[PDB]
Symmetry: none
């Protein structure tokens, strides 16, 4: 096509007559210079049958047939590209002084065009993608939908390519890119499944989920988007949705993925597709930049697998608008950030998600540890995940089997106590039907978080001696399913926690459940009955000022929480003494009595009385009712009608006196 | 010099004598092998003048002049790749054999340049932008500055072409990229305007706003930037500007718009300019990624108008940095993001927006409605707007009622009670001369807001049954014009709210005026004389410390807002029994009296007395002052000069009983 | 050794025999024509060795040997357009005739290729970067490792290029790009250093920072990553390094920054490079969106040296994940961003900053100011910076000798009083070994910060008259022995502070040390004996339920921080009676005496008696002990073995009355 079969051994003839210069001489030197000078002489190399290139002295001979002959026979001499010439015949005359042989090409426009135009092969001109890849030198360009061959391999000779995609990759397999340089920029990638699979739509037209098998089935239709494939979790939580699905629409693996195994820093930019997916394997410093709504399929839409080989330092998901799918939206296997928290999602957003919107695989795959450490999950978002929320936790394996094959053994770090030490901040969730988080770790910290309306638990934090700051769990668990709104199974210091919102628990389930954790700054109207924290204290409030709006009194009270859940304990209300629309009020220190609240009172300035209302024991009082020296207690006796008042002697003993006499 | 004359038809000769092969044979085959057995053979083609390549019977023939000959006439044979040549003479002896040879044909360079080069068209060599767009295939460049006339429609077609703009589209008219292809990109546009308009600069040279109507007129300067052209709204924000403002500055329309119609998603990266506009008429999935301070003109800087046809979803303003303009920046219009919140303002920074920061339009523009639903307004900023930092309002109108045509019958949803489902987070506002925040809707879950310094009302929320959180309203109404720093008309429920910073003011009206909401957790300082909520009760918190620094006494200070909300109801507050280190401090429980606080009180440990101090009625007590049983009311008898005790017998009848005697 | 030596001069031999075409003739004509016609003959030029193209007559001649000839001398005959050779022998006969020597018309095709391809010049073709820049119109590409000399000043002539870098850009010192056009898009640059310097790393394998000189010196090694070069300031963090540091590593100044001199809007893009750094000098409206872990050298990784000339508006640092360094990672020097807060930092992510993750070079350099106003720091994060975190101070710490040379006179704004109007929201730090969030200024409104674990200080604030919000300094000062967790010297106001996390304030000093601040609702488990603010008035709180979960009582431990800010000043306990669940508890109003908490208690309902146990002075009462105009004080009289009542008449005449005679 582009190679000529021509005279392989060159012919050098005499200029003034039609004869070859026997015992002639050829010198090769620098461009536009005398080549007779030994210094100007440039290397001139043989090419024997073994591919060697051995230098030889410059005065190359020309035999009596026009070819060039070494001390033996013909040889295929070789110089670099820019070789000058100087023919000298035996006698000493000259024949030629070709200055720059490269200027003698039959078409010397290419020598200039090649140097002032950008190189980019377009796939339309080629029959196979691999053939186009084998020709690209600067950047490929796709101008035609490619029907990829169910998992074909495409090795780009380890080049650096600024691939631009302007057409789909129709197919139902896994196009695999390999051996790309440390500059690749595959962008505009679009993968569409060649097969339209059966999908389910557990939600309805009013944002309200469905946890009923019959309704899920009735919402079973055939289309590439607006749904997802049934998966293991779907018949894990939905009650018996094995028995209501035809085999053909059950356990299929329709998907289209762009696997880029074994590459470093290929920088996948804007990506899209229907039933798409992007599975990086054995990558490092390989980030995926904002992707415009890749509707997922049966595989993780963005899976940063790094099982084999070293860990996965440097895998990012910066930006994104991922949607739908039947398995986790953004996954992470192995992928140790190794200090620097180099990796993890940033600015990500995952609608639907048939699993956690940003999940860090737990347990182990094969015999390889699949947890994720020193990562960074910050400034992200997730909305309406079905089976699991922003599941950060690693080693969340409920099933205990044995030591972890590949990382710290449970003898050193017991499960749910690994020092994976993530970095978290500015998160968000909305409408999650599973659990808002799945965190589990030891000695890590989290920052501003908010879990808005949800149909499941708002937090499942199986941590140990961690710190949670400014958490917000507003109006979560509207389905009433569980009773563990925000659950913490380990010592923790939640501060600035937000709980019940516009929706009212109305005695449903329970709110915060951290019997091993201490929480402070719990703000919001939550019925205190349903709180089970080991400790709780607002140690630091200044000189407070309680206010009451719409009420006729200010309810300042204590409500010992171990004595009785619903029942209180002590209070110092300030009810209006006697209406006095703008007159005054009375203050009373009410205390709970026989299974009743606010029985006794120390009313002060009742009904504008300007005097106290001290209580007294209605009957005889024992000797054990005083525990403090120099104290005065009134107890009444009806028979004599006089008010006795037993007084603990400051000396320490006790005497009984008569205070008021009729 | 473009082509150098050179003879085709290479000549083959012998190796030891100059004679030329006669009737010989040339056999081609794979590298470094015997090229005679079809096992090692490589195809060889004929490249006639027409370019029609054709195969040949393998054994090449050479006439008596050492030239490849086919069918008598000389022919140029072209192989497919590298090959080993074995030239045998008519006798059959090997004239010469070679294993490796390569000489790419110099002909057919256009065929090798149509493929390996990046197609585009520089506008410098085309008369009309439409003519340049017609010839473009997969790229384009604006080298020369264009001069589009008003309404110049440009036809690109399905061409998915990257318009990398390196020049500016000067013109006070509108440029339309009609029916441009899907997946395109536009970068670096620096749109401008031929006519410099008369602008105003309502902010003084140092800072802050000139609320005076006669102050702006001085700023009238006729500069292309540093001002927003006069607008209808300017005639109601500044009272009395109708008169002084000259007619030349009235009714200006100087703006330049890159109107786009009928596209299914085109990025507009780095869309710079001044006096610019970027309307997206009837467009879907188009996102104005990034920007560079386009000092917008009179029309909205980024207006995703869609009321022509379908609802429109996927329109983003992801990223960017906008400034100036007369009408709101980044205004949406009839975009229902769907369930997945596909349209939003994720990331933004607007400066001195003429009307509003992100105003989502309200009511109905023309017959078709002009509202929005299911959009995400996530992390962003709005600096020194004029009217609204974020007018995410829907069916507001304020005055107009009737019925919204095209959204929802007023019967199904009354005024301001629209289900919008906007998700909001990480907002910010500063120096908003008007309302710094405001919307309406039945059910919205707001999150972190952190408004700050403002010269106007902090917020004007008009929702109904919605929950807010981490709302930080700091130092608003710096000019005191409005009587409310926040006004939540509906029965909302705030969940943590900051109010004052340093601009504390006793000249402002009620800072918060939500008459039916239910706030919780008002942390910042505030004059409680200002709150007007329906129920201020944050229930749930631990043991309190009630600290007081550098101040004599520390207090709890209960206050009933039914009673002289300016005066406290009086409560428990310990004082000092001497200089520091005394170790004694008397807890002084109080209770308000007629329009005077702490007139009636009960003390304990008065300056180290180690004893209580019980108040008594100075005059005679009455039954009205008592009601609870088993309690006595010490009242003084001035006549007999002794402490009587009005005792309420447990039996239910009070018997006036003497207590003390002299 | 790539090409095969070959005779370039064309030798012509007749077709049907092996003879040269003696004294023949060549006609060069138009494409696809018969050149014998005198009209079908294009101009034909000689090319000399020197390169002096000259025209000659058409009917070319051939000497006796076949080579072309002109005046008894050989020549190379070239044309400006594709031709159609026609060779005729001396006798007269068409020995051969090529319709198309090249099969295209380069002259005509040159126009089409010029106007249908994307211009660019790969550096491989050019020797010097300056030469490539001169011979480029746009889309310049770097494809070979251009090892620039210590210095390289490149003048681009004002062209608006699109420079790109697919290969390393090695060198040393500081290369200089100059005269870039308004809109360049330098992307993918990758710098390095030709010298591997001796580096240190004060962090062990567990990130437990090092401070002893011996350890840090022991870890001194030679490499480009994993460490930083010592700086003069490094002699302060670790005392004694001046003596123990070997001379070789004592002050090595190595870096590979590219100095973009005077330029406008050269948006740099993804950048990397070991020991690389970058900086802009005298440059406006430029940004460095994104980055890929550029390890720094002796100079700030992203500096903005815009000191000479006018202030540097618009110098953003959007995005990026810089790492390491020895003097800074985002330092700015002189940038007044106007009222639009233009030219700040957004979406950054530092690491192991040698001095600060973000800096503003407070003080003065040369005879010029080095402060910077009206910037914009948001959505950033700096992890484990050594000397400081978000160092944002503008005024010098203690340099009153100068008066802000070229800046607001100290008289106009005293030390640490410059109105900077910075915009700081949504930040974070972690692991800082210095100060987390240092600051200086007046009248500024920082908010929403989440400082995290950091051995050192949580924040050193010198603001005066500033408002804060949502600040969260948690578990800071890990290494202990530091002055304060947070220090706010000024009349500031703070809102929403989080303090202590899961670490114990045992060996630390005052956690909050703002002697003249007015902090609001301080939340979290902080020891109220470690706070030293001037107020905590949080007035605005609602009804509250101070419920305790673990302990056996619920307390309102009212405190006075003037008597003693350690023990207490009176409580409102409510302990349970007869164990939990019995529905019995007694309220205990109390006070302090003898420097022992709970010395006196007026407890109600002790042991479920419905009584009113009251304390009294165990001796004669004193008129001073009573101050209320109407109140009786009980006092015991062991001599009378009875209680007496110190009674004060309403007018004020003291009276004595017995209470309980026996």
């Amino acid at each position: 096509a582009n190679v000529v079969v021509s005279n392989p051994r060159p012919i050098f003839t005499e200029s003034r007559s039609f004869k070859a210069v026997a015992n002639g001489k050829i010198y090769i030197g620098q461009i536009d210079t005398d080549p007779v000078n030994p210094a100007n002489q440039i290397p001139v190399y043989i090419e024997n049958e073994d591919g060697s290139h051995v230098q030889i002295t410059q005065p190359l001979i020309i035999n009596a047939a026009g070819k060039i002959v070494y001390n033996g026979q013909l040889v295929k001499i070789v110089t670099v590209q820019g070789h000058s010439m100087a023919i000298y015949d035996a006698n000493g005359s000259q024949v030629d002084y070709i200055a720059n042989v490269l200027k003698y090409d039959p078409d010397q426009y290419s020598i200039e065009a090649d140097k002032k135009f950008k190189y980019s092969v377009k796939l339309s001109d080629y029959p196979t993608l691999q053939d186009a890849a084998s020709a690209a030198v600067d950047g490929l360009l796709i101008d035609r939908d490619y029907n990829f061959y169910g998992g074909e391999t495409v090795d780009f000779g380890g080049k650096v390519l600024t691939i631009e995609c302007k057409a789909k990759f129709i197919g139902d397999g896994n196009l695999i890119f390999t051996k790309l340089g440390k500059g690749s920029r595959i962008a505009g990638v679009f993968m569409e499944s060649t097969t339209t699979p059966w999908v389910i739509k557990p939600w309805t037209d009013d944002n309200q989920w469905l946890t009923d098998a019959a309704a899920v089935v009735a919402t079973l239709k055939q289309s590439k988007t607006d749904g997802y494939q049934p998966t293991v979790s779907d018949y894990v939580k939905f009650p018996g949705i094995e028995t209501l699905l035809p085999p053909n629409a059950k356990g299929q693996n329709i998907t289209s993925t762009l696997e880029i195994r074994e590459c470093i820093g290929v920088e996948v930019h804007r990506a899209s597709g229907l039933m798409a997916g992007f599975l990086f394997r054995g990558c490092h410093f390989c980030k995926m930049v904002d992707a415009n709504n890749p509707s997922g399929g049966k595989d993780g839409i963005i899976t940063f697998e790094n099982l084999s080989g070293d860990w996965g330092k440097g895998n990012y998901v910066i930006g994104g608008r991922t949607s739908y799918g039947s398995v986790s939206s953004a996954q992470f296997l192995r992928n140790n950030g190794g200090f620097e928290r180099d990796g993890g999602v940033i600015g990500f957003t995952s609608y639907r998600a048939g699993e956690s919107g940003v999940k860090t695989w737990q347990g182990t795959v094969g015999s390889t540890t699949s947890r994720n450490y020193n990562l960074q999950f910050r400034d992200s978002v997730v909305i309406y995940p079905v089976w699991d929320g922003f599941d950060l936790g690693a080693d969340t394996d409920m099933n205990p089997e044995l030591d972890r094959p590949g990382d710290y053994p449970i003898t050193q770090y017991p499960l749910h106590q690994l020092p994976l030490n993530h970095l978290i901040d500015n998160l968000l969730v909305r409408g999650a039907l599973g659990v808002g988080f799945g965190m589990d770790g030891k000695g890590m910290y989290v920052s501003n978080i908010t879990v808005e309306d949800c149909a499941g638990s708002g937090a499942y934090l199986l941590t140990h001696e961690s710190v949670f700051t400014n958490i917000a769990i507003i109006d979560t668990n509207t389905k009433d399913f569980q009773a563990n709104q925000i659950y913490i199974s380990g010592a923790c210091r939640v501060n600035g926690l937000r709980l019940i919102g516009i929706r009212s628990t109305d005695g449903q389930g329970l709110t915060i459940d951290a019997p091993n954790s201490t929480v402070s700054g719990i703000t919001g109207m939550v019925d205190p009955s349903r709180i089970n924290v080991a400790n709780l204290a607002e140690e630091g409030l200044g000189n407070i000022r309680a206010n009451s709006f719409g009420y006729d009194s200010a309810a300042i009270k204590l409500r010992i929480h171990k004595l009785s859940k619903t029942l209180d304990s002590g209070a110092l209300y300030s009810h209006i003494n006697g209406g006095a629309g703008s007159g005054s009020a009375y203050t009373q220190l009410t205390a709970i009595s026989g299974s009743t609240p606010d029985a006794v009172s120390l009313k002060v300035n009742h009904k504008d009385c300007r005097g106290a209302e001290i209580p007294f024991v209605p009957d005889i009082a024992s000797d054990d009712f005083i525990k403090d020296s120099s104290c005065f207690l009134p107890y009444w006796e009806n028979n004599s009608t006089s008010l006795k008042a037993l007084v603990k002697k400051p000396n320490g003993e006790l005497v009984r006196l008569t205070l008021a006499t009729l």
